[PDB]
Structure formats: structure tokens, C-alpha cells
Design goal:
part of a larger assembly, 8 chains, A alpha+beta, B mainly alpha, C alpha+beta, D alpha/beta, F alpha/beta, G mainly alpha, H mainly alpha, C: alpha+beta, three-stranded antiparallel sheet, two-stranded antiparallel sheet, elongated, D: alpha/beta, two-stranded parallel sheet, 30% helix, globular, binds cardiolipin, binds 1,2-diacyl-SN-glycero-3-phosphocholine, binds iron/sulfur cluster, NAD (chain B), translocase (chain B), electron transport (chain B), membrane (chain B)
Chain lengths: 78, 105, 186, 201, 156, 182, 315, 42
């Protein structure tokens, strides 16, 4: 019915996703619900450099760049 | 050549008749503002390129050059052999030297 | 064997670390592979060898692919072997439903039982996660084996109590077999 | 009204909008004849007061909700009267047909039996709906001017603000514009009551 | 689960650790099959997409056996795993992993060292070491450029 | 429901036939229009071309009917990237507020007949982000949907069951009979 | 002049057009079937019996759907590209080597180069009239690759005409009576396969008309009959390239059934490279068409200039 | 019984890259092409 009482505190864990580093910044207020759960997706930081990488490349070059960036936009858009 | 005109006009007439009957057979629905719009992926919406124009110009120069390489198959049995060989070797060799010089510069 | 540009450590493996060979035999081998399409010939042969392989097409719907006894499909409400409905309106499933699809309204019946007056599962909202069957103290709500329940109309996926009871009546044999073959894992 | 006594009768004059039988009918290739539109008495005699489809839909809803509209005839007409020649010229100004290379010309329909023969053949050969709605009933409907009746209520008694023509119609005829030749439009002139009485004299 | 377990100070058993390691590696192969198939569809070679998605469907059958869903298993929970492994799951995982290497070699026979794939993948989008370090790159984008950072060994 | 017929009862039942209308039409023109509509629906159900519209996770199962185990290509079903060349749009994923005019414009540029398959709980009814600030509560508020495939990631047998249900809907389309009765 | 020559020429040309169109439909069936068998999956099935009337299911569907337009006002320029595309694809077949006389094409290679030089014209009107930036980009890219290998194709066929001594296509038969030209011209066989997959848009040269970097190059706004005529024209170009490979390299063998078996085999090879190779880039394809293939063309044309001079002294 | 490995363990799962057998050699390919075209010229 109501979730297990996590002690109040902040942690940031991060493991090796196949895309990169997948991180959870989980902050709990002592209740059964999390106060904050920020998700570090590696595809967001990989996609943030597309503006510099994609300049002075061709169109098929950019198609291959998103092909090799290994981005999934569910975690990028969160 | 007169039979070629008749068969080409028949192919054109058959294709226009097939497309006219396809336009009759096409399902006519209500025309829309957004259905007539040009397709850009998703959300709705090029200048002159000089590199493609010099690609067309290189194609034109090589096409007119090929149009002088075209006759000499017939002429090989009906001309002077030394003159024909000198012109053919000089023709393709100057073409190759020009291609390699435009590659290097 | 080409030399290493970067010395490979013990716990790592390096790709594209080989030096480009400069002896004339390897240069002629790479030249013949470039000129005569040898690696493209190997790719064409590997492609052509898969025509002679068995096709993996499983010919739906005469032959259907493998499932599991733990499989999550259409939610359904079970019944006791005596015939009384199992759902005691205890509302842990709605409390644990993360998309909040389940709506339960309960009144006391004429003999004094706790059983529901309304049990609705929005299957357009249900995410088929199986938290309700784990949070069910009796074995009332269950994930049935059915997944061929695509509907023509949006309202037909709003499952009532009578639709869930009819699903429990229809799918009772396979659900009971899965629960008999799966209860010691849970 | 003989069967259902408390039946509300909304009478639209001519309804314009998107996917209509007014602007699309005056927008079609099959209506024109060699870049020239035939009109009855050059479109000058007939005066039409067209109404938007959202206005008559709001009138239908306001009649359905308010129960004082039982058995009352509601004249559904627009805000201002226009004659057909100025309407068609304004439409062709909106579709960028006013350029001199297009060759726009308005001429009398009664001198042209070929157009009526084309309309009859179009009503004949079409199995479903005729193309452009060029049945002779639409011809007689565009021939008949819009006459309002005094003492019979108008949609402003149903509490709907009628949309003016110049706000809505350029949005409708924006996809219908022609391609510009390689070589804002003026609004049309409304016809008042005294000018209509002078024209019909 | 490691976030909630580090908040709760809860240590999982060793069988749960090995099950999560094996399914994380199965997940890693599934992700890289999706990456290779998507990249080959974007470049143009559409054959290894289906050639590897058969293998991907076999691992999704493994996920379906262990949890009951082909994806979104909801299987790893804070405190271990939700359900125990069914009997004979590893007797299929071993046969599958024995058969997977020949399919890997068949993919590299058509994708690796094909000159068109090299022309679409070599000297394209060059990322330096300071680029990947400053711009927050992680994983393969770190290790494409030469950085030896793998989080499965540095912080186990 | 109805009880599915017992084989003692079903042996007395005659064969259904291919045509849902039946060959018992009275007029010869009505029968000819019925067979022309049967041929037209056979041509339409013989090849529907869905559009590559993959919004979210559901689409990972959508490629799994492209996959060699399920093999959508032997059902007339093959993906087309351009919306003009496609018959079907499969809404496979989560329609958001920034995604709404893109989906509406892509559907409006598709030519009619237009059948829409809602794949997954985010596509129909909103689903697991139904109470979100930037998720449309199902795609039925924007695009008119003919088939609704239920599972959160529909198994690929269930998506192909939705495809076969769409083929049964296309086979049940009555156009020329309605024209004769219009 | 005898009228049965005109009557039989008309009958043979119309029979050729009909059989080419039905072979285009069955070539689409063959491509969807064995292109599936390139991977593990099966081809078309379950329609009719064993998937045979699947192209007729395509033809009934494509001739019934709503003919949409890239703009609402003026769209007659949208119509003239599939008409001329199918006209050229059915008109190029008149220079096929027929041993029983249909058309006495003494210059058949020039006719083939003419129809290929109109291929750029039909794809240019395909690109421009579709009113989209994707359509213009695909049309410019297709015009770029087709005029880039037009010069190469002219030089390769010009090197082949030196072997037979004339421009008559039936003269390929008399010079292949002892052996095929696949033995003597195997780098020319690989180069001619790279040529024939470039003028007709196939997967190795697909930056013009692909589904990855563009959604579609010049078929992006073409649908409901126009796409059907364009698709039939492209597959007729594939059939013509298969026949023209089978005439030049493989022995012409026009009567034998083994010639048409080899034509189906070269169509199988065209679908075999459809499933295998990835797609080239714009810069690498400008490198390929103007440097490597052009240098090979001029060099091995010099080789046959020397060889035809050497045999002229010996004969 | 629980889901456990068999006694003696599983066999060694192959993970290395084995190349396909390459019969041809570049000198051999060039020489055979030269010999084949020299017979073909005659
Ligand atoms: C205007 C006029 C009408 C125009 C429109 C016509 C539409 C026709 C299609 C359609 O939808 O029909 C449904 C419509 C409704 O059918 P139904 O009565 O509901 O179903 C019949 C059975 O109950 C259920 O069918 P069934 O189980 O009896 O099987 C049907 C069919 C078997 O099915 C087929 O033949 C299907 C087609 C397979 C074609 C495969 C090769 C394709 C090659 C392409 C190149 O069976 C037969 O043909 C009899 C046995 C043949 C054995 C052959 C052994 C060879 C060795 O079909 C008919 O009315 C059938 C009669 C009209 C069709 C044409 C008959 C004359 C021409 C025959 C072919 C000549 C060559
Ligand atoms: C539209 C035209 C599409 C492109 C057609 C290119 C035909 C080749 C160019 C040419 O001049 O061909 C001469 C050829 C004649 O070739 P010929 O004179 O070398 O052949 C001798 C003639 N026979 C084969 C009958 C013995 O003429 C045509 O191709 C006529 C084309 C008519 C086009 C009609 C529509 C306009
Ligand atoms: C004027 C021509 C009219 C007939 C055109 C051909 C129609 C053939 C047809 O639809 O056959 C498929 C359909 C049946 O095929 P189907 O495509 O509906 O189903 C295939 C069967 N399963 C799904 C079980 C694998 O045939 C009929 O309905 C009866 C055909 C009778 C013969 C018609 C002419 C055949 C040549
Ligand atoms: C190899 C190439 C083959 C090309 C042809 C492939 C298909 C051949 C067999 C099927 C023919 C189908 C004909 C009708 C096609 C259009 C269907 C349609 O919507 O019709 C509505 C129309 C009008 O009906 P309506 O009143 O519903 O239309 C009003 C407009 N909407 C749809 C918006 C409501 O029907 C007709 O015009 C009836 C035509 C009867 C004769 C059909 C052709 C017979 C000869 C062939
Ligand atoms: S948890 Fe089970 S018994 Fe309790 S209310 Fe839900 S379905 Fe009924
Ligand atoms: S499976 Fe999950 S989403 Fe569906 S009713 Fe049960 S708890 Fe709710
Ligand atoms: S319905 Fe389920 S599987 Fe589909 S997009 Fe939504 S969360 Fe993903």
C-alpha cells in the first residue's frame, strides 16, 4: 500500500550503461515517495556536442553521426 | 525511323490513357489545406550551388569530348593507320594528362 | 603479424591498433582485394549462403511463438472452486497500480461479504506490469494468457467488473495451470 | 412543421468556408471557361448575403440550448450584403488572378449556351457527385438573389456574433492562389438598401 | 536498485548479484544489437538488422521466460530480483551463447572491412580526448578516443 | 458473448466462404458491384503499407514484426518512409504536446483511405503518463483510430493480430454497395 | 513497301511492351521474395496462393488510392514525369537484339545513351515539380550521379564497341560464338555492374533515392498511380540493365532459353547486391565516377586501341 | 532443486573472432587474371 520508509538523504549512483554512464541522483525526504529523482542519461551529453561535431560535415556524415552516437530519446527527453 | 515515331507515340498514348484511367479510378475525397502541403518531415516549412554547376560543366565538356571519340571505330578500316593511331593516342593521352593535372591541382 | 602502435595493457583490448603493413606481399594482397573486389566477394558469398538457410518465419496464426507461464497479458478476475468470487475488495492492487488504472468501489453484500460493487481496469491505462497479482493476498486478479484482444473502438478497452469476470470464466484452465506451475517461484 | 410543431427552422442563405460548395465551386477549373468566369447578368443583378459555417453551427447550438426557439424561423444571413460580381472579383483578387498575364474576364452567362451544355454533360457523365458541383440546381441557386424577410428573426437574436467576410475568406483562399507570373488586395464594395433598390429599379 | 539500496544500506545476496550481472550483460548485447542494426539501417545495409534481430528476439524470449514480458521486465527490484530464475533457463542461455559467435562472425563478414562501411565510418565525427573529457562524454565515446574508462572495473 | 460452436453443431454448419457479403445478391448489377468491391478489398487488404512512425518503445516491437521470426512482409505489410506512399500509420509510442501538430500534419498529408493503428497504452488512453503535463491523453483526440492494440509493449503476435484485424476491417469495407444504395 | 513488315513490327513491339510490364510485376515479386531470403525471413506469402498475385495486390491498391498533389492550384507538371519515365523505360527496349527483325537499329548504343540521357530529364522534372526541399535535394542528387556515370558509361560502352567493330547490337552475337566476353572483360564486368546500379537507383548507389538520409529522393510526393508508373519504370530499367549485361558480356544467345535464364540470374544478382552493400557518399561517389572509373575507362580504351591496331595488321 | 550449473560446469563459450578461409593470394589473383585475359585475347 505505502512504500518502504527510505531514510532521508541524497545519493548519486552511476553505472556503465551500454550507451554510457547512466546515473540516478535520488534524494529522499524520509517518506514513502522520493522527493527528487534526477536521471543522468548519457545520450543527453552525447547529443549536446552534435552542434560542434556536425559542422563542416556532409548530410550522410551527420546521418552516420546520429547512427554512431547511440542515442535513445526517451532518456534524453526524460 | 518512321516506325519508331509511331511506336513512341503509341507508348505515350498508352501511358497517358493508363494514367487518365488511374485518375478516374483514384478515390476522390475532400481536398484539404494540409493535404496539399509540400512534405517536410513532421513540422511544416535551396540556393544556387556552384559545385554542382561545375559538375554539370565537367560532364558537358567530357560529353562533347566523347562525341569525338565515338566515330573512330568505323574509320579504323577506312583511313590511314598511322594518322588514326597518332590522333587516337594523342587524344586519349592529352585527356589522361588533363585529368591527372586537374586531380593534382 | 603487424606491430602495435600502442602497447596493449593486461586488462584492455585495442581495436584498429595494427600498423599498416609495408612489405610488398601485403601491399599486393590489399591491392588485389581493392581492384578485384575480394572482400565484396566474401560478403556476397556470406549473403548468398543465407538463402540456403532455414527461414525463421513462424507462420502466424496457425503456429504461434513461445510464451512463458509468467507471461503478462489480459488482466482477469479469478474465482474460488466453490464458485464465490475471490476479490475481497482489499484495494492493494489499486494502491500499487503505478498508472492508477484500477478503480474499486465496495459495499457490504446481503450475506455480509466484502466483495466489490465496482472493479474497473482501464486497459488503455494499464501497463501490464503485474504488480496487482503480486500485491493480491488471495489469487483474485491475475495476468491471463490472452493477448489477442485488440479492439476496434476505444471504449471497448475500458474493462468493467463483468468483463473481467467473463475473462476469468473463459481463461480459468490456463490461468490455473500457470498458477500451479508458478506459485513456488513467487 | 406539419409533423413536428415545435421544430426550429434555420434558413441559411449560402454558407461559405472550407470544403464548401460556394468557395470551392467558384474556385474550380471546371467552373471557368478559358480563364473567364461566366456570371448571370455579369453578376451585377444578384445580391447575396453569405454566412459562415461556424456561425450557423453556433446558431444551431444556441437554438438547441435555449428553449424559446421552438417553432421559430431564423433567417441565417451574414452581416453585409454583397453583389456577386464584386464577390467574384474579390475572390480572384485573393487568388492572385488580378495579374494581367492571367487574362481574367467577366462576361454574361446568357450569351453562352456552351457552359450550360457543359454543366448538363457534367451532370450526366458523373456517377457520383458532379465535379465542382456544376449541376443546374447550383446554377439556379447562384441565379437567385438572397432576400431577407422583415419581422422574421435573424441569428443575432440567437446571441451569436457573426464573423465578417474579409477576416475569414483570405485564409480559405490562401491555398487556392495561382502561381505568380514571371513578369494587399482591395476589399469589396458592400451594397446598401438604397443602392439595391436603385439597382433593382 | 543500487540507488535505493545505497539509500537503505541494504546488501543483496550473491545469487542476485550474479543474476543482475548476467542480465546486465544480456542487456548490453541487446543494446549493441540495436545500435549496430540502427547504424546499418542509417548507413544503408539492411541485412544485419534482421540477422541480429533474430538473436535479439531470442534474448527477448529469455526475458519473457525469466519475468513474463519481452521488455520492461520489472524484474530487478531494490533488494535483489523480483522472482527466481526458472529451471532450465541457463540450459538455453548456454546453447544460445554458444550459437551467438558464428552469427557475430557472419555480421562482421558483411559489415566489418567492407569498403563502403569504412567509407561511411572512418575519419567521420572525430572526437579528441579533451573533447570527450570536457563535453561530458561517457562510455564508448570516451573509449573510442582512447580513454580507458570503464565503470564496470573502476567502480565495481 | 457467444459460445464457439461445438463440432457436432459445427459439422452441420455450411462453409462461410471468402466473401462477407455472400453470393446471394438478387440483382445482377448488385452482384457485380459486390464482386468488384470484393476484388477491390482484396487488393487493398493484399498490401497495406504502414508508415515508419515510431515515437517510443512500442516501436522496438514494431521492428520485431520486421524481424525474421514474425515477418510482416508475407502479409502485404512493408514499411514506407514517405507518408504519401503509405496506407497505414501505426502510432507506436507516446504522443506529446510538441508531437501533436507533427502527427496531425503527417496524417493529413497521407492520402485516403487512411487506417490508423494505435500501438500501446501511450498511443490509446494516455497510459503511464496519463496524468502528465505534456502528454496527450491518447491519440484518439487528434487522429481517428481504427485498431487499438492493447499491450504496453504489445507482443509482436498481438500487433500482428491488430494487423489481421485491420485486414478483416478492410475486407469488410463496403463502398460500391453503398454507392448503389446512395 | 510491304505492309506485313509494319504489322508484324507493331505486333512484336506491343507484345514486347506487354511482356516487359508483366515481367516488371513479377520482378517486384522476385525482389520482395529473394530479398527476404537474403536475410533469414521469408518473402511474400499468404496472398492468393504462395504470394503470386502480390504485385496485383500492389496494382489494385496503387490505382485506387487518392491522387494527392504537392500543391492545390497547378499540378500538371507533376503528371509529366511518370509518363515520360515509363515511356522511356518501355521505349529503350526497342534496341534489344532481335534476330527475327523488329527494328534494324544499326546504332543501338547511341539509342541507349539517348534514353539514359533522358533519365536525368525525367528525374529532374520529378524533383522540381514536387515543391519540397527533400524533393529538390533528391532530384539534384540523382541528376548528379546519373550525369557523373553517364560519361563513364559512354566510355565503357565505347570501349566495348571497339571489340565488335560497329554499333550494331547483333554484332555482339557473332563475336561471342566461341566464348563469352565475361572471360576477357571481368574488371569491365565489375565496372559495368557498378555502372548499371548507378543509372538505375539501387542500393549501392542510393543516396539519390534512399530511405535513410532522405525519406525519399524524388518519389517523396509521388503516390497513387504516379508512384506505380515510376516504380514500373525503374524496374523496367533494372530489366534492361540485366538484358544489356547479358548481351555484352554473356553471349547474346537471343533464341536459346539459357539467355533468359541468365537474364533472370542477372536480375537475381541485382537483387543480391540490393541486400548486401551499404550506400556510398556524395564525395566518395564523385571520387569514384570522375577519377577511378574515368581513368580505368581511358586506360583500357587505350588497351583496345592498341589491340585492335595489332589485330588489324595480323588479319 | 534450484537453477544451478551442472557438475563439471558448462563448456567454454566461444567469443573470439575466427576469420573465414581465404583461398586466394594477390600475386595468384593477378597472375590468373593475366593468364585468363591472355587466353581470351587469342
Ligand atoms: C464483374 C465480374 C466480377 C469481377 C470481380 C471478381 C472478383 C473475384 C475475386 C473475389 O474476391 O472473389 C470472391 C467471390 C466470393 O467467393 P466465395 O463464393 O465467397 O468463396 C468460394 C468458396 O466458398 C471458398 O473458396 P475455395 O475454398 O473454394 O477456393 C477458391 C479457389 C481456390 O483459390 C484460388 O484459386 C485463389 C487464387 C489463386 C491464384 C494463384 C495463381 C496466381 C497467378 C497470377 C499470375 O478454388 C477454386 O478455384 C476451385 C479449385 C481449383 C483447383 C485447381 C487445382 C490445380 C492443380 O468469388 C467468386 O464469386 C468466385 C467466382 C468468380 C471468380 C472468377 C471465376 C472465373 C475465373 C477463374 C479463373 C480463370 C483463369
Ligand atoms: C520524347 C523523346 C524521348 C527520347 C528519345 C530518344 C531517341 C533517340 C534520338 C534519335 O534521334 O533517335 C533517332 C531514331 C531513329 O534511329 P535510327 O535512324 O538510328 O534507326 C533506324 C530506324 N529503324 C530502327 C526503324 C530501322 O528516331 C527515334 O528514336 C524517334 C523518336 C520519336 C520520339 C517521339 C516523341 C517526341
Ligand atoms: C476481371 C478479373 C476478376 C478476377 C481477378 C483475380 C482475383 C483473384 C483473387 O482475388 O484471388 C484471391 C482470392 C483468395 O485469396 P486471398 O488473398 O483472399 O486469401 C489467401 C488465402 N489465405 C489467406 C488463407 C492464405 O480468391 C478468391 O476469393 C476466389 C478466386 C476465384 C478465381 C479468381 C480468378 C483467379 C485468377
Ligand atoms: C493492373 C492495373 C489495374 C487497375 C485497376 C485495379 C482495380 C480494378 C478492380 C476494382 C475497381 C474499383 C472501381 C472503383 C474505384 C473507386 C472506389 C470508390 O470509392 O468509388 C466511389 C464512387 C462514388 O461513390 P460515393 O458516392 O461513395 O462517392 C462520393 C465521394 N466520397 C467517397 C467522398 C463519399 O463510386 C463510383 O463511382 C461507382 C463506380 C462503379 C463502376 C466501377 C468500375 C467498373 C469497371 C472497372
Ligand atoms: S488486491 Fe486482489 S483481492 Fe485485493 S482488491 Fe485488488 S484484486 Fe481484489
Ligand atoms: S498489471 Fe500493473 S498497470 Fe495493469 S492493472 Fe496490474 S498493477 Fe495496474
Ligand atoms: S505503451 Fe508502454 S511500451 Fe508503448 S511507448 Fe508507452 S510505455 Fe512504451
Amino acid at each position: 500500500t505505502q512504500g518502504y520508509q527510505v531514510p532521508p538523504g541524497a545519493t548519486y549512483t552511476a553505472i556503465e550503461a551500454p550507451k554510457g554512464e547512466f546515473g540516478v541522483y535520488l534524494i529522499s525526504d524520509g517518506s514513502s515517495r522520493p522527493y527528487r529523482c534526477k536521471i543522468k542519461a548519457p545520450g543527453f551529453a552525447h547529443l549536446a556536442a552534435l552542434e560542434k561535431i556536425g559542422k563542416q560535415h556532409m548530410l550522410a556524415d551527420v546521418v552516420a553521426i546520429i547512427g554512431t552516437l547511440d542515442v535513445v530519446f526517451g532518456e534524453i527527453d526524460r | 525511323m518512321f516506325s519508331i515515331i509511331f511506336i513512341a507515340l503509341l507508348i505515350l498514348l498508352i501511358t497517358t490513357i493508363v494514367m487518365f484511367l488511374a485518375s478516374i479510378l483514384s478515390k476522390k475525397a475532400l481536398i484539404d489545406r494540409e493535404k496539399s502541403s509540400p512534405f517536410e518531415c513532421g513540422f511544416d516549412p535551396l540556393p544556387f550551388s556552384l559545385r554542382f554547376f561545375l559538375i554539370t560543366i565537367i560532364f558537358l565538356i567530357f560529353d562533347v569530348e566523347i562525341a569525338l571519340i565515338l566515330p573512330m571505330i568505323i574509320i579504323m578500316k577506312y583511313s590511314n593507320i598511322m594518322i588514326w593511331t597518332i590522333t587516337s593516342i594523342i587524344f586519349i593521352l592529352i585527356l589522361l594528362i588533363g585529368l591527372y593535372h586537374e586531380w593534382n591541382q | 603479424e603487424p606491430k602495435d602502435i600502442v602497447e596493449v595493457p593486461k586488462g584492455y583490448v585495442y581495436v584498429n591498433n595494427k600498423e599498416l603493413s609495408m612489405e610488398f606481399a601485403d601491399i599486393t594482397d590489399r591491392a588485389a582485394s581493392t581492384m578485384f573486389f575480394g572482400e565484396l566477394l566474401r560478403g556476397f558469398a556470406v549473403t548468398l549462403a543465407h538463402i540456403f538457410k532455414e527461414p525463421a518465419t513462424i507462420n502466424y496464426p496457425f503456429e504461434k511463438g513461445p510464451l512463458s507461464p509468467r507471461f503478462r497479458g489480459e488482466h482477469a478476475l479469478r474465482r474460488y472452486p466453490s464458485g464465490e468470487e475471490r476479490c475481497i475488495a482489499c484495494k492493494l492492487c489499486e494502491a500499487i497500480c503505478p498508472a492508477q488504472a484500477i478503480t474499486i468501489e465496495a459495499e457490504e453484500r446481503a450475506d455480509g461479504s466484502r466483495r466489490t460493487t465496482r472493479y474497473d481496469i482501464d486497459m488503455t491505462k494499464c501497463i501490464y506490469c503485474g504488480f496487482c497479482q503480486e500485491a493480491c493476498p488471495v489469487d483474485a486478479i491475475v495476468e491471463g494468457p490472452n493477448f489477442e484482444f485488440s479492439t476496434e473502438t476505444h471504449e471497448e478497452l475500458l474493462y468493467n467488473k463483468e468483463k473481467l469476470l467473463c475473462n476469468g470464466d473463459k481463461w480459468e484452465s490456463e490461468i490455473a495451470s500457470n498458477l500451479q506451475a508458478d506459485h513456488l517461484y513467487r | 412543421r406539419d409533423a413536428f410543431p415545435n421544430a426550429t427552422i434555420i434558413r441559411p442563405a449560402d454558407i461559405y468556408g472550407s470544403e464548401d460548395r460556394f468557395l470551392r465551386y467558384y474556385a474550380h477549373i471546371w467552373r471557368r471557361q478559358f480563364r473567364s468566369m461566366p456570371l448571370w447578368h455579369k453578376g451585377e443583378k444578384t445580391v447575396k448575403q453569405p454566412v459562415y459555417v461556424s456561425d450557423v453551427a453556433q446558431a444551431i447550438i444556441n437554438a438547441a440550448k435555449d428553449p424559446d426557439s421552438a417553432g421559430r424561423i431564423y433567417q441565417a444571413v451574414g452581416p453585409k450584403r454583397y453583389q456577386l460580381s464584386e464577390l467574384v472579383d474579390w475572390f480572384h483578387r485573393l487568388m492572385r488572378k488580378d495579374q494581367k498575364r492571367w487574362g481574367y474576364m467577366r462576361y454574361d452567362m446568357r450569351w453562352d449556351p456552351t457552359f450550360l451544355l457543359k454543366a448538363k454533360l457534367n451532370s450526366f457523365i458523373c456517377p457520383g457527385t458532379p465535379i465542382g458541383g456544376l449541376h443546374p440546381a447550383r446554377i439556379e441557386r447562384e441565379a437567385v438573389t438572397d432576400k431577407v424577410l422583415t419581422g422574421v428573426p435573424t441569428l443575432e437574436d440567437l446571441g451569436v456574433t457573426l464573423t465578417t467576410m474579409e477576416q475569414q475568406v483570405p485564409w480559405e483562399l490562401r491555398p487556392y492562389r495561382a502561381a505568380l507570373y514571371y513578369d494587399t488586395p482591395s476589399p469589396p464594395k458592400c451594397i446598401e438598401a438604397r443602392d439595391e433598390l436603385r439597382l433593382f429599379a | 536498485s543500487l540507488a535505493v539500496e545505497k539509500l537503505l544500506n541494504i546488501d543483496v545476496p550473491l545469487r542476485a548479484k550474479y543474476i543482475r550481472t548476467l542480465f546486465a550483460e544480456i542487456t548490453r548485447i541487446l543494446n549493441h544489437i540495436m545500435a549496430v542494426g540502427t547504424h546499418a539501417l542509417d548507413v544503408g545495409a539492411l541485412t544485419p538488422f534482421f540477422w541480429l534481430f533474430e538473436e535479439r528476439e531470442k534474448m527477448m524470449e529469455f526475458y519473457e521466460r525469466v519475468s513474463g514480458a519481452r521488455m520492461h521486465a520489472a524484474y530487478i527490484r531494490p533488494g535483489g530480483v523480483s522472482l527466481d530464475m526458472p529451471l532450465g533457463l541457463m540450459d538455453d542461455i548456454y546453447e544460445f551463447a554458444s550459437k551467438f559467435a558464428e552469427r557475430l562472425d557472419e555480421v562482421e563478414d558483411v559489415l566489418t572491412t567492407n569498403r563502403i562501411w569504412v567509407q561511411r565510418t572512418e575519419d567521420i565525427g572525430i572526437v579528441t580526448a579533451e573533447e570527450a573529457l570536457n563535453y561530458g562524454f561517457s562510455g564508448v565515446m570516451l573509449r573510442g578516443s582512447g580513454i580507458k574508462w570503464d565503470l564496470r572495473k573502476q567502480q565495481p | 458473448q457467444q459460445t464457439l460452436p461445438v463440432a457436432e453443431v459445427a459439422q452441420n454448419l455450411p462453409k462461410k466462404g471468402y466473401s462477407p457479403f455472400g453470393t446471394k445478391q438478387s440483382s445482377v448489377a448488385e452482384w457485380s458491384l459486390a464482386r468488384l468491391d470484393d476484388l477491390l478489398n482484396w487488393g487493398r487488404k493484399g498490401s497495406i503499407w504502414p508508415l515508419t512512425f515510431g515515437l517510443a518503445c512500442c516501436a522496438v516491437e514494431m521492428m520485431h514484426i520486421a524481424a525474421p521470426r514474425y515477418d510482416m512482409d508475407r502479409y502485404g505489410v512493408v514499411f514506407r518512409a514517405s507518408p504519401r506512399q503509405a496506407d497505414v500509420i501505426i502510432v507506436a509510442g507516446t504522443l506529446t504536446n510538441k508531437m501533436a501538430p507533427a502527427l496531425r500534419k503527417v496524417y493529413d498529408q497521407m492520402p485516403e483511405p487512411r487506417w490508423v493503428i494505435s500501438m500501446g497504452s501511450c498511443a490509446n488512453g494516455g497510459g503511464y503518463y496519463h496524468y502528465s503535463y505534456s502528454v496527450v491523453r491518447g491519440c484518439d483526440r487528434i487522429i481517428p483510430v481504427d485498431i487499438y492494440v492493447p499491450g504496453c509493449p504489445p507482443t509482436a503476435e498481438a500487433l500482428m493480430y491488430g494487423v489481421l484485424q485491420l485486414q478483416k476491417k478492410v475486407k469488410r469495407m463496403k463502398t460500391l454497395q453503398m454507392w448503389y444504395r446512395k | 513497301m510491304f505492309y506485313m513488315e509494319f504489322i508484324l513490327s507493331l505486333i512484336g513491339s506491343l507484345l514486347l511492351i506487354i511482356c516487359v510490364l508483366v515481367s516488371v510485376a513479377f520482378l517486384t515479386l522476385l525482389e520482395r521474395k529473394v530479398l527476404g531470403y537474403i536475410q533469414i525471413r521469408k518473402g511474400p506469402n499468404k496472398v492468393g496462393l504462395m504470394g503470386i498475385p502480390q504485385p496485383f495486390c500492389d496494382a489494385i491498391k496503387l490505382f485506387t488510392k487518392e491522387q494527392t498533389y504537392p500543391l492545390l492550384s497547378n499540378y500538371l507538371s507533376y503528371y509529366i514525369s511518370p509518363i515520360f519515365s515509363l515511356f522511356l523505360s518501355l521505349f529503350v527496349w526497342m534496341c534489344m537484339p532481335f534476330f527475327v527483325k523488329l527494328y534494324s537499329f544499326n546504332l543501338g548504343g547511341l539509342f541507349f545513351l539517348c534514353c539514359t540521357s533522358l533519365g536525368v530529364y525525367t528525374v529532374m522534372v520529378a524533383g522540381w515539380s514536387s515543391n519540397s526541399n527533400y524533393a529538390l535535394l533528391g532530384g539534384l542528387r540523382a541528376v548528379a550521379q546519373t550525369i557523373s556515370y553517364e560519361v563513364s558509361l559512354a566510355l565503357i560502352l565505347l570501349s566495348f564497341i571497339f571489340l565488335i567493330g560497329s554499333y550494331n547490337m547483333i554484332y555482339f552475337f557473332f563475336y561471342q560464338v566461341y566464348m563469352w566476353f565475361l572471360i576477357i572483360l571481368f574488371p569491365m564486368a565489375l565496372v559495368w555492374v557498378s555502372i548499371s546500379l548507378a543509372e538505375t537507383n539501387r542500393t549501392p548507389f542510393d543516396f539519390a533515392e534512399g530511405e535513410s538520409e532522405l525519406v525519399s529522393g524524388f518519389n517523396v510526393e509521388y503516390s497513387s498511380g504516379g508512384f506505380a508508373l515510376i516504380f514500373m519504370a525503374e524496374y523496367a530499367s533494372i530489366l534492361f540493365m540485366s538484358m544489356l549485361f547479358c548481351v555484352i558480356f554473356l553471349g547474346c544467345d537471343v533464341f536459346n532459353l539459357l539467355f533468359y535464364m541468365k537474364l533472370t540470374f542477372i536480375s537475381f544478382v541485382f537483387i543480391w547486391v540490393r541486400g548486401t552493400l551499404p550506400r556510398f557518399r556524395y564525395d566518395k561517389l564523385m571520387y569514384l565516377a570522375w577519377k577511378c572509373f574515368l581513368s580505368f575507362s581511358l586506360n583500357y580504351l587505350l588497351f583496345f586501341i592498341g589491340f585492335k591496331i595489332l589485330l588489324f595488321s595480323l588479319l | 532443486k534450484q537453477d544451478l550449473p551442472p557438475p563439471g560446469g558448462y563448456k567454454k563459450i566461444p567469443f573470439a573472432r575466427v576469420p573465414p578461409k581465404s583461398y586466394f593470394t594477390g600475386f595468384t589473383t593477378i597472375g590468373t587474371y593475366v593468364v585468363v585475359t591472355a587466353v581470351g585475347l587469342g
